[PDB]
Amino acid sequence: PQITLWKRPLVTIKIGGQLKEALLDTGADDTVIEEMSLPGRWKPKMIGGIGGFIKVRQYDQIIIEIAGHKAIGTVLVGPTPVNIIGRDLLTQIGATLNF
Amino acid sequence: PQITLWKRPLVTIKIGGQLKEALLDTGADDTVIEEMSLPGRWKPKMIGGIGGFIKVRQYDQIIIEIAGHKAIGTVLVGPTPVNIIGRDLLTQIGATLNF
Ligand SMILES: CCCC[C@@H](CN[C@@H](CCCC)C(=O)N[C@@H](CCC(N)=O)C(=O)N[C@@H](CCCNC(N)=[NH2+])C(N)=O)NC(=O)[C@@H](NC(=O)[C@@H](NC(C)=O)[C@@H](C)O)[C@@H](C)CC
Protein backbone atom coordinates (compact mmCIF):
# COMPACT_ATOMS: atom_id res chain seq x y z
CA PRO A 1 0.00 0.00 0.00
CA GLN A 2 0.82 3.70 -0.20
CA ILE A 3 0.38 5.56 3.05
CA THR A 4 0.19 9.34 3.11
CA LEU A 5 1.19 11.22 6.25
CA TRP A 6 -1.73 13.56 6.92
CA LYS A 7 -2.52 11.23 9.83
CA ARG A 8 -0.16 9.15 11.99
CA PRO A 9 0.91 6.06 9.96
CA LEU A 10 -0.65 3.60 12.43
CA VAL A 11 -1.02 -0.02 11.40
CA THR A 12 -2.20 -3.18 13.07
CA ILE A 13 0.52 -5.59 14.16
CA LYS A 14 0.28 -9.11 15.53
CA ILE A 15 2.77 -10.19 18.16
CA GLY A 16 2.37 -12.98 20.68
CA GLY A 17 -0.93 -13.82 19.03
CA GLN A 18 -2.23 -10.37 20.00
CA LEU A 19 -3.29 -7.52 17.74
CA LYS A 20 -1.87 -4.10 18.59
CA GLU A 21 -1.58 -0.74 16.84
CA ALA A 22 1.91 0.47 15.97
CA LEU A 23 3.42 3.51 14.29
CA LEU A 24 5.52 3.02 11.14
CA ASP A 25 8.54 5.09 12.10
CA THR A 26 11.32 6.01 9.66
CA GLY A 27 12.96 8.02 12.45
CA ALA A 28 13.46 4.93 14.61
CA ASP A 29 16.39 2.55 14.25
CA ASP A 30 14.59 -0.14 16.22
CA THR A 31 11.14 -1.51 16.95
CA VAL A 32 9.86 -0.69 20.42
CA ILE A 33 6.65 -2.12 21.88
CA GLU A 34 4.82 -1.45 25.13
CA GLU A 35 5.18 -3.73 28.14
CA MET A 36 4.08 -7.29 27.28
CA SER A 37 5.09 -10.93 27.71
CA LEU A 38 7.42 -12.40 25.09
CA PRO A 39 8.99 -15.88 25.07
CA GLY A 40 12.64 -16.64 25.81
CA ARG A 41 15.48 -14.67 27.35
CA TRP A 42 16.14 -10.98 26.92
CA LYS A 43 19.30 -8.86 26.99
CA PRO A 44 19.63 -5.22 28.13
CA LYS A 45 19.55 -2.30 25.72
CA MET A 46 19.61 1.46 26.14
CA ILE A 47 17.73 3.53 23.56
CA GLY A 48 17.38 7.27 23.16
CA GLY A 49 14.64 9.57 22.03
CA ILE A 50 13.57 13.21 22.13
CA GLY A 51 13.44 13.33 25.94
CA GLY A 52 16.48 11.19 26.68
CA PHE A 53 17.39 7.54 27.29
CA ILE A 54 15.43 4.59 28.63
CA LYS A 55 16.27 0.95 29.38
CA VAL A 56 14.39 -1.69 27.40
CA ARG A 57 14.31 -5.49 27.15
CA GLN A 58 15.72 -6.90 23.93
CA TYR A 59 14.14 -10.06 22.51
CA ASP A 60 15.62 -11.54 19.31
CA GLN A 61 13.97 -13.54 16.49
CA ILE A 62 10.43 -12.64 17.51
CA ILE A 63 7.75 -13.32 14.92
CA ILE A 64 5.70 -10.20 14.30
CA GLU A 65 3.15 -9.31 11.63
CA ILE A 66 3.12 -5.71 10.46
CA ALA A 67 0.10 -4.68 8.41
CA GLY A 68 -0.20 -8.24 7.11
CA HIS A 69 3.49 -8.69 6.32
CA LYS A 70 5.36 -11.21 8.43
CA ALA A 71 8.68 -10.21 9.94
CA ILE A 72 11.01 -12.04 12.32
CA GLY A 73 13.54 -10.05 14.27
CA THR A 74 14.44 -7.97 17.27
CA VAL A 75 11.69 -6.40 19.35
CA LEU A 76 12.49 -4.04 22.20
CA VAL A 77 10.00 -3.98 25.09
CA GLY A 78 9.80 -1.06 27.49
CA PRO A 79 8.21 2.25 28.65
CA THR A 80 7.69 3.69 25.17
CA PRO A 81 4.94 6.33 24.70
CA VAL A 82 3.70 4.46 21.60
CA ASN A 83 4.44 1.15 19.86
CA ILE A 84 6.82 1.97 17.03
CA ILE A 85 7.96 -0.12 14.08
CA GLY A 86 11.54 0.87 13.33
CA ARG A 87 13.77 0.57 10.28
CA ASP A 88 14.94 -2.89 11.32
CA LEU A 89 11.48 -4.32 10.63
CA LEU A 90 10.38 -1.79 7.99
CA THR A 91 13.21 -3.11 5.79
CA GLN A 92 11.86 -6.65 6.26
CA ILE A 93 8.41 -5.66 4.96
CA GLY A 94 9.91 -3.84 1.98
CA ALA A 95 8.92 -0.33 3.07
CA THR A 96 10.47 2.72 1.38
CA LEU A 97 9.87 6.45 1.80
CA ASN A 98 8.99 8.19 -1.46
CA PHE A 99 8.40 11.73 -2.75
CA PRO B 1 13.16 9.84 -4.88
CA GLN B 2 12.60 6.44 -3.31
CA ILE B 3 14.44 6.18 -0.03
CA THR B 4 15.29 2.73 1.33
CA LEU B 5 15.52 2.35 5.09
CA TRP B 6 18.77 0.40 5.46
CA LYS B 7 20.24 3.54 7.02
CA ARG B 8 18.73 6.59 8.72
CA PRO B 9 16.83 8.70 6.12
CA LEU B 10 18.85 11.91 6.47
CA VAL B 11 18.37 15.05 4.37
CA THR B 12 19.93 18.49 4.13
CA ILE B 13 17.50 21.34 4.70
CA LYS B 14 17.85 25.11 4.56
CA ILE B 15 16.07 26.93 7.36
CA GLY B 16 16.65 30.53 8.44
CA GLY B 17 19.27 30.66 5.71
CA GLN B 18 21.14 27.84 7.45
CA LEU B 19 21.96 24.42 6.04
CA LYS B 20 21.17 21.61 8.47
CA GLU B 21 21.12 17.82 8.37
CA ALA B 22 17.74 16.40 9.38
CA LEU B 23 16.00 13.08 9.89
CA LEU B 24 12.84 12.24 7.91
CA ASP B 25 10.67 10.99 10.76
CA THR B 26 7.24 9.51 9.93
CA GLY B 27 6.80 8.88 13.66
CA ALA B 28 7.03 12.62 14.37
CA ASP B 29 3.94 14.82 14.26
CA ASP B 30 5.99 18.01 14.08
CA THR B 31 9.30 19.28 12.76
CA VAL B 32 11.74 19.91 15.62
CA ILE B 33 15.00 21.77 15.08
CA GLU B 34 18.02 22.32 17.34
CA GLU B 35 18.37 25.74 18.95
CA MET B 36 18.49 28.50 16.35
CA SER B 37 16.96 31.92 15.80
CA LEU B 38 13.73 32.26 13.79
CA PRO B 39 11.80 35.46 12.99
CA GLY B 40 8.44 36.41 14.47
CA ARG B 41 6.43 35.51 17.55
CA TRP B 42 6.51 32.09 19.16
CA LYS B 43 4.69 30.12 21.84
CA PRO B 44 6.08 27.50 24.26
CA LYS B 45 5.22 23.85 23.70
CA MET B 46 6.11 20.55 25.38
CA ILE B 47 6.83 17.61 23.11
CA GLY B 48 7.41 14.02 24.13
CA GLY B 49 8.71 10.67 22.96
CA ILE B 50 11.28 8.12 24.15
CA GLY B 51 12.93 9.54 27.25
CA GLY B 52 10.20 12.03 28.10
CA PHE B 53 9.45 15.65 27.21
CA ILE B 54 11.39 18.75 26.21
CA LYS B 55 10.17 22.35 26.08
CA VAL B 56 10.40 23.99 22.67
CA ARG B 57 9.48 27.30 21.00
CA GLN B 58 6.79 27.16 18.32
CA TYR B 59 7.15 29.36 15.23
CA ASP B 60 4.43 29.36 12.60
CA GLN B 61 4.66 29.85 8.83
CA ILE B 62 8.37 29.07 8.56
CA ILE B 63 9.65 28.20 5.08
CA ILE B 64 12.02 25.27 4.81
CA GLU B 65 13.75 24.01 1.69
CA ILE B 66 13.90 20.23 1.54
CA ALA B 67 14.99 18.11 -1.43
CA GLY B 68 14.50 21.00 -3.86
CA HIS B 69 11.01 21.62 -2.50
CA LYS B 70 10.21 24.84 -0.64
CA ALA B 71 7.67 23.93 2.07
CA ILE B 72 6.06 26.16 4.72
CA GLY B 73 4.66 25.54 8.19
CA THR B 74 5.22 25.28 11.94
CA VAL B 75 8.72 24.58 13.23
CA LEU B 76 9.52 23.83 16.85
CA VAL B 77 12.94 24.93 18.16
CA GLY B 78 14.56 23.48 21.24
CA PRO B 79 17.10 21.11 22.85
CA THR B 80 16.43 18.21 20.48
CA PRO B 81 19.38 15.78 20.00
CA VAL B 82 18.53 15.33 16.29
CA ASN B 83 16.96 17.73 13.77
CA ILE B 84 13.64 16.08 12.94
CA ILE B 85 11.42 16.58 9.88
CA GLY B 86 7.90 15.55 10.90
CA ARG B 87 4.62 14.82 9.14
CA ASP B 88 3.63 18.49 9.16
CA LEU B 89 6.26 19.15 6.48
CA LEU B 90 6.59 15.66 4.94
CA THR B 91 2.95 15.91 3.73
CA GLN B 92 3.79 19.16 1.91
CA ILE B 93 6.49 17.51 -0.20
CA GLY B 94 4.15 14.59 -0.87
CA ALA B 95 6.10 11.98 1.08
CA THR B 96 4.48 8.56 1.45
CA LEU B 97 5.35 5.16 2.93
CA ASN B 98 5.16 2.33 0.43
CA PHE B 99 5.36 -1.44 0.75
C1 LIG C 1 7.89 7.36 20.76
C2 LIG C 1 7.17 8.58 20.26
C3 LIG C 1 6.74 8.43 18.80
C4 LIG C 1 7.93 8.24 17.87
C5 LIG C 1 8.98 9.34 17.99
C6 LIG C 1 10.26 8.95 17.28
N1 LIG C 1 11.22 9.87 17.33
C7 LIG C 1 12.55 9.61 16.80
C8 LIG C 1 13.38 10.90 16.77
C9 LIG C 1 14.89 10.72 16.52
C10 LIG C 1 15.70 10.75 17.81
C11 LIG C 1 15.54 12.09 18.54
C12 LIG C 1 13.12 8.65 17.85
O1 LIG C 1 12.84 8.80 19.04
N2 LIG C 1 13.86 7.63 17.42
C13 LIG C 1 14.44 6.68 18.36
C14 LIG C 1 13.47 5.52 18.62
C15 LIG C 1 14.00 4.40 19.54
C16 LIG C 1 14.83 3.37 18.80
N3 LIG C 1 15.71 2.68 19.51
O2 LIG C 1 14.67 3.19 17.59
C17 LIG C 1 15.78 6.19 17.84
O3 LIG C 1 15.94 5.95 16.65
N4 LIG C 1 16.74 6.11 18.74
C18 LIG C 1 18.08 5.65 18.40
C19 LIG C 1 19.09 6.77 18.59
C20 LIG C 1 18.99 7.87 17.57
C21 LIG C 1 20.12 8.86 17.77
N5 LIG C 1 20.35 9.67 16.59
C22 LIG C 1 21.33 10.57 16.48
N6 LIG C 1 22.16 10.76 17.50
N7 LIG C 1 21.47 11.27 15.36
C23 LIG C 1 18.46 4.45 19.25
N8 LIG C 1 19.09 3.52 18.70
O4 LIG C 1 18.15 4.45 20.45
N9 LIG C 1 8.37 10.63 17.77
C24 LIG C 1 8.64 11.64 18.59
O5 LIG C 1 9.47 11.54 19.50
C25 LIG C 1 7.91 12.95 18.31
N10 LIG C 1 6.67 13.07 19.08
C26 LIG C 1 5.47 13.04 18.49
O6 LIG C 1 5.31 12.78 17.29
C27 LIG C 1 4.26 13.24 19.40
N11 LIG C 1 4.39 12.44 20.61
C28 LIG C 1 3.83 11.23 20.71
C29 LIG C 1 4.10 10.54 22.04
O7 LIG C 1 3.13 10.72 19.81
C30 LIG C 1 4.06 14.78 19.68
C31 LIG C 1 2.65 15.03 20.17
O8 LIG C 1 4.96 15.23 20.68
C32 LIG C 1 8.84 14.14 18.62
C33 LIG C 1 9.97 14.22 17.59
C34 LIG C 1 8.02 15.44 18.63
C35 LIG C 1 7.27 15.74 17.36
From Swiss-Prot, chains A, B:
Transmembrane segments: none annotated. The active site is at 25 (for protease activity). It comes from the Viruses. Residues 20-89 form the Peptidase A2 domain. Residues 1-5, 49-55, 88-99 are annotated as: Dimerization of protease. Homodimer, whose active site consists of two apposed aspartic acid residues. Aspartyl protease that mediates proteolytic cleavages of Gag and Gag-Pol polyproteins during or shortly after the release of the virion from the plasma membrane. Cleavages take place as an ordered, step-wise cascade to yield mature proteins. This process is called maturation. Displays maximal activity during the budding process just prior to particle release from the cell. Also cleaves Nef and Vif, probably concomitantly with viral structural proteins on maturation of virus particles. Hydrolyzes host EIF4GI and PABP1 in order to shut off the capped cellular mRNA translation. This is Protease. It comes from Human immunodeficiency virus type 1 group M subtype B (isolate BH5) (HIV-1). The gene is gag-pol. The chain holds residues 501 to 599 of 1447 of the full protein.
